[PDB]
Amino acid sequence: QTPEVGIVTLEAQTVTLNTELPGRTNAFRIAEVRPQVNGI
Amino acid sequence: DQAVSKQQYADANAAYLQSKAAVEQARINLRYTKVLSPISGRIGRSAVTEGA
């Protein structure tokens, strides 16, 4: 009785390496209306 | 030909140089309206955008 062993073979193939990064969403043009005069 | 005095030539030349200084004041102020980068290198991101 020889040792019987489950054996898998390896094969070369391409693999991609994605990542995941958190972050906010800032707008493209966000102006802000500050006045330039003095009054009501 | 000295049809006008040297005194009121030196006054006019002083007025010309003083007005040229007062217009190059406005010329460098227009140079300050546009923003020139003071040194060279990797610029980051804009802190304020168009219209702010």
Side-chain angles (χ1 to χ4, degrees), chain B:
Chain B
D1 204 1
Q2 289 183 357
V4 68
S5 296
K6 291 182 181 180
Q7 182 63 254
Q8 56 183 355
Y9 174 70
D11 289 331
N13 196 1
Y16 168 67
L17 293 174
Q18 186 175 1
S19 180
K20 185 172 73 176
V23 73
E24 71 182 2
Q25 280 288 109
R27 188 178 295 115
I28 57 94
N29 201 354
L30 286 173
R31 186 178 64 84
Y32 290 159
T33 56
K34 62 181 75 174
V35 176
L36 278 75
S37 179
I39 51 97
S40 67
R42 295 288 301 274
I43 188 165
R45 64 181 180 179
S46 65
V48 297
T49 183
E50 299 181 357

Side-chain angles (χ1 to χ4, degrees), chain A residues 9-30:
Chain A
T9 60
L10 296 173
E11 291 177 352
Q13 66 182 358
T14 63
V15 61
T16 61
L17 277 75
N18 289 319
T19 187
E20 185 176 1
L21 296 175
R24 300 289 181 181
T25 58
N26 286 319
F28 184 70
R29 292 187 178 99
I30 173 171

